[PDB]
Each structure stands twice: as C-alpha cells, then as structure tokens.
Design a protein around this ligand. Sequence first.
Ligand SMILES: [Cl-]
Ligand SMILES: [Cl-]
Ligand SMILES: [Cl-]
Ligand SMILES: [Cl-]
Ligand SMILES: [Cl-]
Ligand SMILES: [Cl-]
Ligand SMILES: [Cl-]
Ligand SMILES: [Cl-]
Ligand SMILES: [Mn+2]
Ligand SMILES: [Mn+2]
Ligand SMILES: [Mn+2]
Ligand SMILES: [Mn+2]
Ligand SMILES: [Mn+2]
Ligand SMILES: [Mn+2]
Ligand SMILES: [Mn+2]
Ligand SMILES: [Mn+2]
Ligand SMILES: [Mn+2]
Ligand SMILES: [Mn+2]
Ligand SMILES: [Mn+2]
Ligand SMILES: [Mn+2]
Ligand SMILES: [Mn+2]
Ligand SMILES: [Mn+2]
Ligand SMILES: [Mn+2]
Ligand SMILES: [Mn+2]
Ligand SMILES: [Mn+2]
Ligand SMILES: [Mn+2]
Ligand SMILES: [Mn+2]
Ligand SMILES: [Mn+2]
Ligand SMILES: [Mn+2]
Ligand SMILES: [Mn+2]
Lengths: 81, 87, 105, 106, 98, 98, 93, 93
Amino acid sequence: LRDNIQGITKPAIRRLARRGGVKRISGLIYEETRGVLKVFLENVIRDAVTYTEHAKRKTVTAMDVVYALKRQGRTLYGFGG
Amino acid sequence: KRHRKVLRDNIQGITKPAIRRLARRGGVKRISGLIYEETRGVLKVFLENVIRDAVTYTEHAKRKTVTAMDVVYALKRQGRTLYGFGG
Amino acid sequence: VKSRSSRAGLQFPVGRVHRLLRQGNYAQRIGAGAPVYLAAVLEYLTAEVLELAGNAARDNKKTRITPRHLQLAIRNDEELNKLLGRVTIAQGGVLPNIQAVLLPK
Amino acid sequence: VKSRSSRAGLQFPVGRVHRLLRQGNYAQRIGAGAPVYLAAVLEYLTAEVLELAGNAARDNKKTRITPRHLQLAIRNDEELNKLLGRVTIAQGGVLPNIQAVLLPKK
Amino acid sequence: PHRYRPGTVALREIRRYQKSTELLIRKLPFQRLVREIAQDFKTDLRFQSSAVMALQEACEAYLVGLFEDTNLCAIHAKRVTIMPKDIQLARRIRGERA
Amino acid sequence: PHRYRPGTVALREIRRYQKSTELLIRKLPFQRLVREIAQDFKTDLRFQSSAVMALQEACEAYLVGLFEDTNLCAIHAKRVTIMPKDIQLARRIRGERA
Amino acid sequence: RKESYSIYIYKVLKQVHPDTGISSKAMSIMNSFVTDIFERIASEASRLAHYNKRSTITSREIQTAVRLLLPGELAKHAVSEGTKAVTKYTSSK
Amino acid sequence: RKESYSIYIYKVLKQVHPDTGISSKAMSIMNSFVTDIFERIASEASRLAHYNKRSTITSREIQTAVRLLLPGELAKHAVSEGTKAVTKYTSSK
DNA sequence: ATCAATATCCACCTGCAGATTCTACCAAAAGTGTATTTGGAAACTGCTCCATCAAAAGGCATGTTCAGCTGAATTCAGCTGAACATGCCTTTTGATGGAGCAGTTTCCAAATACACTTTTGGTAGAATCTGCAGGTGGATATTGAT
DNA sequence: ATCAATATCCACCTGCAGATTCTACCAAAAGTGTATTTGGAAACTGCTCCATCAAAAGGCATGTTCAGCTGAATTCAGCTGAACATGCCTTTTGATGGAGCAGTTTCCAAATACACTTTTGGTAGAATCTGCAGGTGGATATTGAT
Ligand SMILES: [Cl-]
Ligand SMILES: [Cl-]
Ligand SMILES: [Cl-]
Ligand SMILES: [Cl-]
Ligand SMILES: [Cl-]
Ligand SMILES: [Cl-]
Ligand SMILES: [Cl-]
Ligand SMILES: [Cl-]
Ligand SMILES: [Mn+2]
Ligand SMILES: [Mn+2]
Ligand SMILES: [Mn+2]
Ligand SMILES: [Mn+2]
Ligand SMILES: [Mn+2]
Ligand SMILES: [Mn+2]
Ligand SMILES: [Mn+2]
Ligand SMILES: [Mn+2]
Ligand SMILES: [Mn+2]
Ligand SMILES: [Mn+2]
Ligand SMILES: [Mn+2]
Ligand SMILES: [Mn+2]
Ligand SMILES: [Mn+2]
Ligand SMILES: [Mn+2]
Ligand SMILES: [Mn+2]
Ligand SMILES: [Mn+2]
Ligand SMILES: [Mn+2]
Ligand SMILES: [Mn+2]
Ligand SMILES: [Mn+2]
Ligand SMILES: [Mn+2]
Ligand SMILES: [Mn+2]
Ligand SMILES: [Mn+2]
C-alpha cells in the first residue's frame, strides 16, 4: 500500500528535471513537484470530465482532454484535434 | 496646408520620476540606475504591439480615426482585457 | 403582455439577452431557456461584485462606488480575482501590499 | 467540371474550407473568395513547416518526418515558434540547451 | 538640519501611490509618444482622446504589474534593488520576448 | 573502483533526455493517479487510452517547461540547485499564483 | 442609439445596497464586466454545442459553460440562480 | 466516416520535399496544426465582421485576420499566397 | 598538461518487425444551373469631435551635492545531495474473453423559426439634487538625533 | 528612554461638477398562428476498454561515502536615496474651423436557396520499407596519479 501520487517516483521527477536542464536537485523538490502535478491534473481532468458529462458519456475521450487543455491555454497537437 | 512639427525622441518623455512612481505602485523600494532605459524599451515594445493591432482594426474599418474600441479590441487580442472604455 | 424577465423573476432583460444570443453567431438556433439562464447568471454575478464593491465604498466612508472600490472588492476576493485575473480595471489602482523584507528592522 | 481548388491553383480543398466556415458559426454569409484565401493561407503555412521539418529530418539522416522533427523545426524558427508559443507537440521533446553556468570550468 | 534615512521616503512613496489610482505618467508626453509610434506605423492618423487614455491605462497597468514581478525577482536574489536582470527574468517567465 | 565526480552523470543525463522524446513517468502509476483524481469528479468512469496518453503528454510537457523556468530562477539567485522556492517564484510569475 | 445594462445594474445595486450610488466610470466598468462574462459564457456554449454536433444552445449548454468558466462557489450559486429562473419561467403562461 | 487534411498535407509534402515521408503521429500533429490555424483565422475574421456590423466574412476579413494573427514575415507571405489564389480563382471561368 | 585506465560515445553495417504506401470500390459532399433575395457600396450630408491655438501659472522635472547602507566580493565550514553498488518488486506486456458502451438508425412530440401585427420598456437629452474633492487647522503618530 | 522636525489623520465646511429624476418617442419586445426541425428515446450492434494472468525485466528503493555547494560572516567601495535650488513645460480653460464619422437612400453585384448531377475523399484489406535495436571496434572524455 502506497499513495498514487507517490507512485510518481523520485527518479521519474528527476528525469523530467533533466529534460528541463536541471543539474542539481534539492531534496524537497519531489514533494513540491508532486503537489504542482496534482493541481495540474485536477484542473485538466475536472474540465475534461465536465465535457464528458455534457456529452452524456461515461468514457473520457481524448478529444475531451484536448478541449480541456485548450480551455486552460495549453493546446495539445496530435490527439484528434 | 501646414504639417505638424516632427515627432521624435518622445520616449524620453517617459521621465525618470514617472518610472519611479510606477515602480512605487509596484511596491518597489530601491531602483538601479539602469532600470529607466530598460523600462523605456519594454514600454515601447508594449505600445508598438498594441497600437499596431489597434491601427489594423482602424484600417479594416476604413477609418482614419483610432477609436477607444479599436484599442480595447487590440488589447483583448493580446490577453490584456480592459474595462472602462465602452468595452 | 408579460415581460419574460418578470416571468423568470429577474431584473436583467431576458429578451435583450436572447436577441444578443441570436446576433452573436453562437449557434443556428437558441433555446428559450438559454437567455433566461444566462441573464440570471449575469444578474447574480453583477449582484456579487456590487455587494463586495458596496462594502468597499462603505469601508472608505463613501456613498458612491468608484472604480477603486470595484478593484478592491475584486482583488480581495479569491474567486472574483481568479475570474478576472487577466482583466484590467481602469482607474482601479492596486491593493496596498509591501513585501515584509522591505520594512525597517 | 473543375474543382475550385484547381481553379485557385491549390492542393487544399477550397470547397471543404467553405463548408467548415459555414458550419463553424462565424457569420451569416460567407463570401466566395474567403474559402479560397483561407485555403491558400493554410496551404502556405503547411508548406512552410513541412519544408523546415523536412530539413530537420535530413539533418537527422532520416527520410520520414517525425514529431521530433516538427518540434526541432518549429522551435528553431523564430516566427513559427512565436505563432505556436502556447502549443504543445506530442512526442516532440525539447531543444538541447544547457545554461553555460552548469558546464565544467576547466 | 533634518534628514530621513534612505528607504524611509521610498516606503512612504509606496504607501502613497498604492493608496491612489491616478495615472502616474504625464499626459501630454504620453500622447506625443503614442502619436509618434502610430505615425511610424501609419500616417495621417487621428486619435479619440479616450483611445489615448485607454492606451495609457493599459500601459501603466502593465508596467505596475511588471514591476511587482520584477520586485519579486530581486527579492529572490536576496536583493532590495530591482535591476534590468530582474525585469528580463520576469518577462522571460511570463513568455514575453526581447 | 571508478567514480564520476558529482555533476558529471547529471550533465550526461541532461544531454540524454534532451535528445529523447520518451515519456519519463512510468505509464501504469500515472494511469492509476489519473483514474483516482478523475474518480473524485465522477464515478464509474472509463478512459480512452489515447486520452490517458494525451494527459501524460500534456503533463510531462508542462513539468519540463516549469523545470526550465525554475532552473532560471535558481540560477538567478546565484545557485545551481533548484529549490521549492524557485518553483514557487516561477509559478507566481506565470500567473498560476498570486 | 447606444444601449447598455445600466438600469438593470442600478436596479441590482439598489437591491443589495439601497443607500449606495455608483459613479459613471464605475458603471462603465460594470457594463464591460457584464458584456465580458456574457461573451465568455456564450462562446463556451457555442463551442460546446459544436463539439456534440448540436445546432441549439439550450439552458444545459449555458449551465456547463458556467461550470467551466466560473470558480467553485461562484459557479454553484450561478447554477442555482439559473435553474430557479428557468423553472420559474417554464411554469408561466 | 471521419475526415482530415491528411492527403492534402501529404501532397504538399511531396510538392516541397519529393523524397520525404511522414509518420502517422506526425500527420496527426499536422492535422491539429491546420485545424488550429483554421480556427484562429476564422474566429478573428468573425470578430472583425461583427465589430463593423457586417454579416459577411469576405476575403478581406481573412486578410486582416492573417495580418493580426501571423508574425511579420509569415504574415506577408500568407497575404501574398492568399491574394494570388484569389486572383487566379477570379481568373478561371 | 601528459602517463595510464576505466567507461563513454561514435561509426559503420546489419536484419526485420512494425508501420507506411499502394490498390480497389461506393455514399457523401462538391459542383451546376436557376430563381431570388439581400447585404452594403456609392453618393450626399447633418454634426460630433478632433486638432490647433493662445496664454497664464504653478506643479514638477532636472541637475547637484553628499553620505548611508546596499550589493558584490571573499572566505570558509558543514552538511546536503550525487554517485554507485546491491538486491528486491512492481511495471510491462501480451493475448484473451467478456461485455459496457459509444455511434447510428428510426420515429414523432415538443420546441423553434417564421411573418405580421400591437404594445410597452429604455433611451436621449433637459430639469433638479447632492456627494465629495480641496482647503484649513489642530491632534496623533512616526522618525531620527543626543 | 526623551525631544524636535515633519508627516499623518480625522473632523468640519462649501460650492460644483457630476449623479439622479423627470418627460417624451420608437425601436424592440411580446403576442398569434402556421411551418419545420431537432434531438430525444427504445432496441441493437461492433469495439475499444476493463480485468486477470503470468511471467521476466529492468527500474526503483536502500545505504555509504564524501565532493562540492550553499549559506553565513565580514568588508568596503561606490551607487543610489534624500534634500534643495531653478526654471521649464505640462496642465487648464475656452474658442474655432473643418475633417470625418455616422445616418439615410438608392440599387445591383453577390450570396442563398433548392434540384440534380458528378466526383472525390474514406474505408478495409493489399504490398513494400525505414529505422531500431545490436554489435563490434575505434577514439573520446573523465579521473586519479609521474
Ligand atoms: Cl494549470
Ligand atoms: Cl433551452
Ligand atoms: Cl400550471
Ligand atoms: Cl496650472
Ligand atoms: Cl450490469
Ligand atoms: Cl420608462
Ligand atoms: Cl412607460
Ligand atoms: Cl426536442
Ligand atoms: Mn469573399
Ligand atoms: Mn468502472
Ligand atoms: Mn442588501
Ligand atoms: Mn445588502
Ligand atoms: Mn568505424
Ligand atoms: Mn505486418
Ligand atoms: Mn438591405
Ligand atoms: Mn563612504
Ligand atoms: Mn548587503
Ligand atoms: Mn561594489
Ligand atoms: Mn569538507
Ligand atoms: Mn551490483
Ligand atoms: Mn449493453
Ligand atoms: Mn479630502
Ligand atoms: Mn453642469
Ligand atoms: Mn530645469
Ligand atoms: Mn467632409
Ligand atoms: Mn475519382
Ligand atoms: Mn479519387
Ligand atoms: Mn478515391
Ligand atoms: Mn540504433
Ligand atoms: Mn541508430
């Protein structure tokens, strides 16, 4: 038993930081990162599911996510629109 | 029959004490001597962009007078929505 | 003759809102409930920021709400601040706020 | 019988662009020339990023354009980068870039 | 001979201008600046006075807004003095360019 | 016994992952997380695999960008180590906070 | 021939604050506010009708748009007001 | 049945690099690109027509929208191509 | 910077599964040809509203002097975060079977759009009201020197 | 822990520019009565999607050691804030001529609206290809020590 956000592990966060050009990482970064990540996902998923509900569906489609992302000013290319 | 005097160097009309005041409203306590020129540059870019889009709206309307609505629409294009001017 | 606003129990003009919906190029047809709902929401939001602004006016010994009172009302309210987080209020100024590290001692 | 795309000298579907304009709730009437103009613009921009991405794939010694190649193409070009400054390309990665202060001294 | 220590009048000014809402750039100079820029983009242009005023409202709101972020960047560097470096950082993170 | 000096492997990794385009969070834990968060908004929900993938793409892009701005803030403070402080400053200036 | 929301805004003002007035600049700002929120909600509604191949914007579209645009509590109260206005309206002849 | 810009994008790909291919994911990304820019230009044109109480989105609206949406150089070339296609289309009976 | 010694990369070739291109047909758009409307451009033109202009005066911008305290440089120690070896467990994956739903028809009842035809609500100024911005002067507080 | 030297408040006053009320038309709601659609609402698919299962594989968690980085301390030069003198130029007020919005008609060039007639773009199998993952063997980079 472990929490799901803790399933977002330290080395994965580290790899992401590496792609962002970070050379050295404070030990307190990982929890902070998990927090920010959770806020992001909450916002996006909330919007997406709202689209779902409006479409009277039970399956969150990729288009729902793309539309939600466009609402948050984070347009994604490559998933149907 | 007469044309207006040449306009030039009017960015210097953005005086040091005025920039100082703006910083004060920004809650800034101390200011490096090189701030005012940077501020003038940044301001000029901002104004150039907004006025460009505005004037584009004017042109498209086949007008010669820039309206407050032109500026409001222009500002909204740039994610800087303005209230108060018939917006 | 019965105002649709009246029938909806609203101050905001339901008929005008319906017309603007028709003229705004949003959809081919507009349901009869949509302008009712929209005008209701608009009126509610109006009431909320007018409530908070009226409070700001009273706090400043003022009878008449100004752009300043509106700004203070909005920026001091998390939800309205977020709703209008990219809106500029002319003649509104800013919230008094000084970073602690800038104070003496 | 000749399509309006052929008559406008375009690869992109003028008729389809017209239909999309009508069905997109933009105005009550759509002029004849608007779908032509729009189709031409979309085709030009497509040619642009396709060319730069083609170059990027040639540089990578690849024949087939990938998301990565489109990303390298777009980010390395000032204007396409500006035009898509708030667009995320799936499986595109990032430009190799390391702040000088992070490199070894001697 | 009386003399306030440096910083005192600065904080006084912060309180003063954060209390008020008046435009802080002189009107006529800003109007001239606007006419200059516009003219360089297109000649024979006329301006509604309220359009100039809107432009000034936008410009001052933007600059006050930018100075807050700048102040935060200087304070992040354990400084009290804002520097071009700070403005540049703020505008980079904001997604503004050069 | 061989050992690389601290910083070396890190730079290695920066070059490696700046070259690749692979998702860096492991797929299943992320799908778990997504389904939980989503569960809090509506229950008995199903997810297109392309929807979960779109989420992870958008997400990792977001976090990599934020790590860039964060790194800039740490370098601004004459540091080389990113700290929560840095992420905070970046997110405030981004408009995601205050 | 320029119309605004001024009299409606004033009505609501008197409702929440009977002894409080509003300056014309502030009323102008209020007018901008109402037109803005109008446009955001109507645009979102348009978009939502479009996504689901629908040609009609019903109260349901306005509602989802409201839930998308407005932050929590504001949204909840807005939804309340909208629903009540609608039911009250449909009960009338 | 669903439709996309795939074949037109591929045709332009051949017109611009004759011996270059494109992966499916890349093709999706290009589709999203065309759809996006379409929506931007169309939306702005709509706004333009609305601002001037016009009911028709003509080539001119698309032009101004292009000038407002595309950065300098790209905008110039886009306007060029547009005018070219429209004159050529007016030049075919 | 040179002597040696791990590891890291980089080059060139290689073989193949996973995808990509190419081929072969049918509804659905796209194109035509009429029959109408209808938007909006042209041509006066009634009138706000912008551009000058003038002229007086004081609110501020400019420039100088000068000293305080801020930023930048330097040093140093301790403790944090990186590198690495070790060993365990969760992710990946790969069909497989089942079944929960999206995606599409197929009807009609309700709702919406028309086209006229009355009925009011809202707007543009004129006619009354009245907060509040500015101007003073005395109390309270704030700040900085001995 | 006290005194001067300013700045900060808060109350009280008063005419004015700005807000609130009063009247008067007209476009805009609202009311009727046909005339279409539109999006449900049941009954069924085909299809992704969930749930197991079952290994193997890397990838993650753990712990030790310690390089090197961050933050604290100290110093000082010089930048920048405060105060002051000087005089410019922005601000204010009011008028005037006319450029250029808009408001109204007057009408066709252009779009819409059907009715058919064609043709193209999609779909589901068919037919080759590009890299990717591997494999040396050759230099490079990195680190400790003459
Ligand atoms: Cl976000
Ligand atoms: Cl409805
Ligand atoms: Cl009843
Ligand atoms: Cl004066
Ligand atoms: Cl069941
Ligand atoms: Cl009335
Ligand atoms: Cl009446
Ligand atoms: Cl129905
Ligand atoms: Mn046209
Ligand atoms: Mn379920
Ligand atoms: Mn009340
Ligand atoms: Mn109340
Ligand atoms: Mn070789
Ligand atoms: Mn195969
Ligand atoms: Mn007409
Ligand atoms: Mn000294
Ligand atoms: Mn210091
Ligand atoms: Mn120094
Ligand atoms: Mn040590
Ligand atoms: Mn081992
Ligand atoms: Mn079923
Ligand atoms: Mn006062
Ligand atoms: Mn008066
Ligand atoms: Mn002087
Ligand atoms: Mn004239
Ligand atoms: Mn064919
Ligand atoms: Mn064909
Ligand atoms: Mn075909
Ligand atoms: Mn390989
Ligand atoms: Mn390879």
